[PDB]
Amino acid sequence: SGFRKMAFPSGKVEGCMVQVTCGTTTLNGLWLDDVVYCPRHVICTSEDMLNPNYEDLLIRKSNHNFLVQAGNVQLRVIGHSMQNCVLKLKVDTANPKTPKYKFVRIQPGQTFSVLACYNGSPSGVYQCAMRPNFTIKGSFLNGSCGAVGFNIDYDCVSFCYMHHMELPTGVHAGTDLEGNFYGPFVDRQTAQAAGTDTTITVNVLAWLYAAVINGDRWFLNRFTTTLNDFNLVAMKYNYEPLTQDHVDILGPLSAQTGIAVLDMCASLKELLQNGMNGRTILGSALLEDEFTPFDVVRQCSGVTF
Amino acid sequence: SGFRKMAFPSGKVEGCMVQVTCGTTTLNGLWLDDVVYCPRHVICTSEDMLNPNYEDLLIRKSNHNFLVQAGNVQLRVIGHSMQNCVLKLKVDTANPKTPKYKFVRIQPGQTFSVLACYNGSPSGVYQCAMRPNFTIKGSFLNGSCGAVGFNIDYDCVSFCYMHHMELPTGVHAGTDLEGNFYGPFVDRQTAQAAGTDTTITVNVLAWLYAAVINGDRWFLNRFTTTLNDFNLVAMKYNYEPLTQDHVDILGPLSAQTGIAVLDMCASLKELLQNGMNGRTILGSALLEDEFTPFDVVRQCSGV
Ligand SMILES: *[C@@](O)(CO)[C@H](C[C@H]1CCNC1=O)NC(=O)[C@@H](CC(C)C)NC(=O)c1cc2c(OC)cccc2[nH]1
Ligand SMILES: *[C@@](O)(CO)[C@H](C[C@H]1CCNC1=O)NC(=O)[C@H](CC(C)C)NC(=O)c1cc2c(OC)cccc2[nH]1
Numbered sequence: 001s002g003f004r005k006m007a008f009p010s011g012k013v014e015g016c017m018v019q020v021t022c023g024t025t026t027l028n029g030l031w032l033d034d035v036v037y038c039p040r041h042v043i044c045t046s047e048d049m050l051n052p053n054y055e056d057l058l059i060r061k062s063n064h065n066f067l068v069q070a071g072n073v074q075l076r077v078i079g080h081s082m083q084n085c086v087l088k089l090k091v092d093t094a095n096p097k098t099p100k101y102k103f104v105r106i107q108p109g110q111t112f113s114v115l116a117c118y119n120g121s122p123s124g125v126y127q128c129a130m131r132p133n134f135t136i137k138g139s140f141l142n143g144s145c146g147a148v149g150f151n152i153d154y155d156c157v158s159f160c161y162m163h164h165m166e167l168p169t170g171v172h173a174g175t176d177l178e179g180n181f182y183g184p185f186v187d188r189q190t191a192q193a194a195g196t197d198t199t200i201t202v203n204v205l206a207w208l209y210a211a212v213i214n215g216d217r218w219f220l221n222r223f224t225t226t227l228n229d230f231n232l233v234a235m236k237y238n239y240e241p242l243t244q245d246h247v248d249i250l251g252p253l254s255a256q257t258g259i260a261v262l263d264m265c266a267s268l269k270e271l272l273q274n275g276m277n278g279r280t281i282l283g284s285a286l287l288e289d290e291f292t293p294f295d296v297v298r299q300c301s302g303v304t305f
Numbered sequence: 306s307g308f309r310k311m312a313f314p315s316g317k318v319e320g321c322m323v324q325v326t327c328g329t330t331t332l333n334g335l336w337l338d339d340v341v342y343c344p345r346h347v348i349c350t351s352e353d354m355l356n357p358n359y360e361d362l363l364i365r366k367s368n369h370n371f372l373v374q375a376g377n378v379q380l381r382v383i384g385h386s387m388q389n390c391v392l393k394l395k396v397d398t399a400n401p402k403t404p405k406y407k408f409v410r411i412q413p414g415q416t417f418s419v420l421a422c423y424n425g426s427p428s429g430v431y432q433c434a435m436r437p438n439f440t441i442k443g444s445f446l447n448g449s450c451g452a453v454g455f456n457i458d459y460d461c462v463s464f465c466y467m468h469h470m471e472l473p474t475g476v477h478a479g480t481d482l483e484g485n486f487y488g489p490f491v492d493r494q495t496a497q498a499a500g501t502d503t504t505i506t507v508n509v510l511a512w513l514y515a516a517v518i519n520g521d522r523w524f525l526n527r528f529t530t531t532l533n534d535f536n537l538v539a540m541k542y543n544y545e546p547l548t549q550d551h552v553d554i555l556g557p558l559s560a561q562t563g564i565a566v567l568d569m570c571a572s573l574k575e576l577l578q579n580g581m582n583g584r585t586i587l588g589s590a591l592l593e594d595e596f597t598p599f600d601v602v603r604q605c606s607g608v
Contacts, residue, residue, distance in 0.1 A: 001475050002444040006429035009420065011316030115314065124311035125430055137588075139307040139604050170306045170519060286590050302446040304426040 003210065003282060003299055005290070007113035008152040010125040015097030018075065019120030020089070020146065021067040028117045028146030029068065030159070032098050036068050036075070036089040037177060038146045039164050040082055041187050049189035058082055069120060084179030085187050086162065099157045103177040106160040108132040109200040109240070111292050112149040114161070119143060129203070129290040132240050133195040134183025135171035152305050167192060200289040201239045202246035205264050207288045209253035210296040211281045218279060220259065223266040230265040237272045249293045306608045308515045308587055310596070312418035313457045315430040320402030323380065324425030325394065325451065326372040333422045333451030334373065335464070336400040341373055341380070342482060343451045344469050345392040346492050354494040363387050374425060389484025390492050391467065404462045408482035411465040413437045414505040416597050417454040419466070424448060434508065434595035437545055438500040439488025443477040472497055504544045504594050507551040510569050511598040514558035516586045518605045523584060525564070528571040535570040542577045554598045
């Protein structure tokens with residue numbers, strides 16, 4: 001037993017980190033088959049990043065302007081193109097460590113592992129949740145751009161995040177592997193602010209199911225609710241509304257505990273309206289919202305890859 | 306910026322994880338060169354684990370009694386010895402993925418990465434600290450025995466932990482890679498208690514510095530304290546004493562923030578005496594003690 005934030009084993013992604021350099025600008029890229037993916041702003045000088053015209057800056061660059069390195073080994077760039085905010089560089093070598101992979105665009109509330117990475121060298125791995133305001137509460141220093149976030153299902157690596165930006169508030173913002181930002185952010189050297197954040201309701205419920213699985217069920221009440229009623233109430237507390245997908249992915253935990261989703265919602269609603277009354281759940285006075293239902297399953301029942 | 310519980314990348318260790326089965330008992334082993342290390346209770350039956358006379362059980366075993374699977378390949382055991390609670394199985398094949406490694410014994414309050422692992426397949430990675438009562442607060446389910454903890458310095462993996470046990474309180478116990486338990490625990494099937502768990506003071510102070518580096522300052526105050534008077538109050542709260550070394554290891558964090566160590570101690574003393582009201586620090590409602598000063602430096606230098 002025990003309940004912790006847990007990243008996926010990172011070896012399959014470590015074998016795909018490389019360093020990409022233009023001029024003196026360096027960052028991380030993701031080497032899959034014979035293509036390297038990285039943030040397009042690598043083509044910018046410091047002064048270019050203030051107000052960049054990426055189409056114009058790229059028109060002046062050739063394959064031979066791009067330094068791609070696995071460790072100290074150079075991979076010759078033989079083609080380049082821009083997709084949204086990500087640069088794609090065809091290299092002359094197929095990465096022999098390429099895992100089975102997909103590119104996915106995750107939803108707010110979903111979690112992923114971030115492989116922290118500097119100059120193409122992995123440095124750490126940790127778990128993150130996409131906040132409803134499309135930031136992540138990460139740990140990123142200078143040179144971290146291009147670091148990726150991923151999930152592993154079976155033996156397939158699902159890439160969902162590539163790092164670009166730190167906001168003034170100290171949270172982080174980035175794109176999917178197709179170069180589309182999560183949230184209303186742009187890759188300019190400017191101070192940008194995220195929408196007001198909210199609590200990830202589906203994850204709080206997951207966490208309550210986790211508590212119940214562990215015999216901690218004082219908070220189960222006698223009421224139920226409609227989904228619409230619950231959503232209208234939850235927004236009054238800065239909680240995200242539930243989708244039908246959210247109800248669906250709570251199913252297994254609902255079946256395992258025998259507690260219908262809408263019953264657990266009525267239980268959570270009472271907690272919001274009346275507070276914890278000095279009690280804890282799983283040892284915490286805070287309701288935790290960065291464990292998805294899959295995370296609860298991974299840690300309460302055990303899953304391998 | 307930002308501060309997060311972070312484990313080392315696990316690839317170098319994943320390549321060493323294998324599965325070891327004896328009879329009806331299966332757990333994880335660590336494959337380095339031509340040796341696979343695993344917990345020795347893999348040789349016990351249900352009846353045996355109650356009170357195993359391990360040397361007796363071990364001698365009655367043959368090489369072929371041990372099934373070692375590395376992925377889709379089975380490894381041929383050509384020998385077997387025992388070092389304390391760790392069984393050493395010789396195999397006819399060197400692990401080609403063997404990294405540069407050493408076996409170290411970690412000290413209380415130090416952190417390491419755990420590669421959670423089932424049936425020789427890794428399931429996740431997270432960071433832990435060796436607590437002063439020599440338990441760790443982990444996440445370990447059935448078939449997790451043999452999972453290892455480690456640190457990576459440059460390209461050398463320092464193995465420091467192999468998992469054996471979950472105490473009735475839900476915390477976890479294990480050995481170094483020479484088979485010596487951390488703490489007063491024994492690999493028999495009995496309910497075992499640990500000594501009273503104290504709080505790792507130098508780590509709580511480091512985490513408070515991290516909170517300051519990241520914009521959280523509500524807990525600071527104008528007061529200072531002497532080392533001794535801080536230790537008087539801390540021990541009253543079951544916090545480990547702070548040593549002059551500890552003060553010294555915190556120097557870099559004091560420099561960066563401009564808050565003297567004994568000033569941070571005055572803040573911590575007030576937090577202990579007053580609690581946190583309804584406030585949080587780095588998103589936590591509890592004083593965190595599983596981040597070392599180096600964990601904090603490596604994540605907040607330059608911020
Ligand atoms: C290993 O996987 C066994 O090979 C496992 C560790 C996990 C089980 C679930 N959580 C874990 O961390 N260890 C054990 O199952 C054994 C270890 C001994 C050395 C054989 N048991 C315990 O850790 C255990 C026994 C026991 C008990 O026995 C009567 C009473 C209370 C608590 C308790 N823990
Ligand atoms: C990448 O490593 C750069 O390639 C870097 C991320 C790092 C920096 C430290 N923390 C991180 O997460 N990204 C940036 O520096 C981007 C670069 C492009 C223009 C997208 N910019 C920012 O992160 C950025 C600019 C800011 C600004 O404008 C002056 C004001 C306030 C915050 C801010 N952040």
